[PDB]
Amino acid sequence: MPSDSKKPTIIYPCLWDYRVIMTTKDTSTLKELLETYQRPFKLEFKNTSKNAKFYSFNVSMEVSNESERNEIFQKISQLDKVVQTL
Template sequence: MDSKTAIIYPCLWEYRLITDKPQGLLDELPGLLAPLKYQVCTKNKSAQGKYTSLQLSLVVSSKQEQHALFEKLSNHALVKWVL
């Protein structure tokens, strides 16, 4: 029996973006994600205040799109980590 939960696309997907320049990243997201519609909100700061996490929510239409967005976000200069 497969213990994985099936993901049915399209679906709402969330990425947690960790950055040390939150405003810069917020300014870049419209160009990076166009024409996709998304919501983003600031979540937490690290204990020393150096890093901020942003929660990015958007609808992905396929597993391929989900992975492509992960790669695109991971490779952006202002993103330290994507969870």
């Protein structure tokens, strides 16, 4: 109060999970690139071949702030398959 009034207040240095679903019959290219595990990141597979409509996949990676959250969102949605994101 005795210094600032309004701020973004964005500080969360922990593992964030994003529910990303894709609607394409050619995600094989993503499942191979997402499984690379280049950086400290993981994905929680929702279904192997049961969801005959929308491919659901989770994304768990180290986050420090909006900076990453903005890079992690654009990196996961890099391809042109994913349609629904959370």
